[PDB]
Amino acid sequence: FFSTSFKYVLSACIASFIFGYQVSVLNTIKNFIVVEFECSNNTIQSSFLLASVFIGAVLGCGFSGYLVQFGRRLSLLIIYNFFFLVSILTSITHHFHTILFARLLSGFGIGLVTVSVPMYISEMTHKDKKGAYGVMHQLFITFGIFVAVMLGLAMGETSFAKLWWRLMFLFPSVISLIGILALVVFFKEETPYFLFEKGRIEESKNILKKIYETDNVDEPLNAIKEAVEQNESAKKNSLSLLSALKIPSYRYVIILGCLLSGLQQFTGINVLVSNSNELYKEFLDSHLITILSVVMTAVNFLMTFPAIYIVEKLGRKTLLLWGCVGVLVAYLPTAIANENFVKILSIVATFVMIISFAVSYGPVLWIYLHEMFPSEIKDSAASLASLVNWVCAIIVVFPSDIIIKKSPSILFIVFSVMSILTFFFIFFFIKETKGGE
């Protein structure tokens, strides 16, 4: 291996770290902002504010199609400028209105990352290393979440606090300023799949010529030529944004693609992300909440590492099924228990689900998505599938908190039904991809 392939992956992964940090920055220092702003109406406003990121990420995943059409060059570059300017706005805080709009674009930006970065990795790494390098995207999403917790709880236990949580929202602007200037050493080249948009064939050759340092790249460029000629034809055919529902041959991929992306949220990951400091308040103290959460995100970040190597060994379908097994062992034993014995099962729920998610479904989705739909439909369908993920985030998180307050037994039971449904969905429909186009 030649680390120049990984070099371009890490440069795009700065945007994955800005996503993960934006997701949980406000979710940790939420209580601090309440002090200035105004429980009660704050609980309602805070839920509205949480939604703006999910509603914005839907619109981000939507736009990162019209945007990616101009290249993953501008697509990534633009996020770093945007996120630097959103971080400047989020940091200037006064009232809910300002921070709702600011955290709506922190969601629009986040959306772009979910489509743009996995596509960049998928479109520059070798067929055989595609999965592990795509796993990097999640490895920095998870790292972004944990960093936010360690940075925030650093102030935990004020005048030198009001000038700190402000400095926390501003942190991703410096990271974006790093990433933007870092894509001056890297972003003088765009992924070889740009052969279809621009006939810069010699430039396309010189991309793979540096990636693996092989001067004769007749193998992947003639493989890209066959994938580009399939696109060149479809444009003359005029295959619409849809045509998936119109053509049964294309419906089986768009529907299964959207279904798998949506089923990621029907696991209960973002219930533990957005309500880390809230869901544990039911019994556990404020001193305990901060510990069980800082350990959780550290575990979540650490568990993404084993996925790097086992995504090419087992594959994508083999890993997906194992994640659905571990989630049944995390949900069903806790579901019947609540119809010292259940206090132990609380820690089992805390980590068994986190452990099985970060190594299995978490990264696999964002890499399996850019491995499906081998033709022009690729970028197109990969944007709408990732949008369903952010649509489902609203569909899962919102009712989950309502149902946790009324009956937790029914909640863990419905999540175990989905844990059975997803396993048998992957086993019956989901393909296995280890190298293609």
Ligand X SMILES: OC[C@H]1O[C@H](O)[C@H](O)[C@@H](O)[C@@H]1O
Q: Which residues bind ligand X (CB under 6 A)?
A: 23, 138, 141-142, 269-270, 273, 300, 362, 389
**Directed axis angle between helix 130-152 and helix 286-302, to 10°?**
160
Considering beta carbons, is residue 303 or 411 the nearer one to ligand X?
A: 303
Q: Toward ligand X, which CB reaches closer, 14 or 269?
A: 269
Residue 148 or 195 having the CB closest to ligand X: 148
> Is the CB of residue 372 less than 8 Å from the CB of residue 433?
yes
Q: Which amino acid is at 159?
A: S
Give how far Cα 395 sits from Cα of 12, 47, 117, 327, 361, Å. 29, 14, 24, 19, 18
Encoded amino acid at 143, one letter: F
Nearer to ligand X, 16 or 231 (CB): 16
Nearest distance in Å: CB 389, ligand X? 6
Torsion-angle region of residue 361: left (phi > 0), alpha (psi -120 to 50) or beta? alpha
Distance CA 271, CA 279 (A): 9
CB of 435 to ligand X, least distance (A): 23
- Closest separation between CB of residue 269 and ligand X, Å? 5
Task: Give CA angle at 243 (238, 245), nearest 5°.
Answer: 175
CB 211 to ligand X: min, Å: 25
Q: How far is the CB of 97 from ligand X (least distance, A)?
A: 26
- Residue 77 tokens, joined: 């570059």
- Is the Cβ of residue 122 or residue 138 nearer to ligand X in the bound state? 138
Helix (H, G, I), strand (E, B) or coil at 379: helix
Handedness of CA 376, 377, 380, 383 (dihedral sign): negative
Smallest separation (angstroms) from ligand X to the CB of 19: 8
Cα 42 to Cα 33: distance, rounded to the nearest angstrom = 10
Residue 220 or 362 having the CB closest to ligand X: 362
Give the Cα separation of 58 and 435 in Å (integer).
29
Cβ nearer to ligand X, comparing 221 with 307:
307
In a 3-state reduction of DSSP, which class is residue 349?
Answer: helix
Looking at beta carbons only, is 107 or 192 nearer to ligand X?
A: 107
The Cα–Cα gap between 237 and 247 comes to 13
Backbone angles phi, psi at 246, to 5 degrees: -70, -40
- Shortest distance (Å) from residue 196 CB to ligand X: 28
Quote the least distance from Cβ 391 to ligand X, whole Å. 12
Two tokens, residue 39: 């429980």
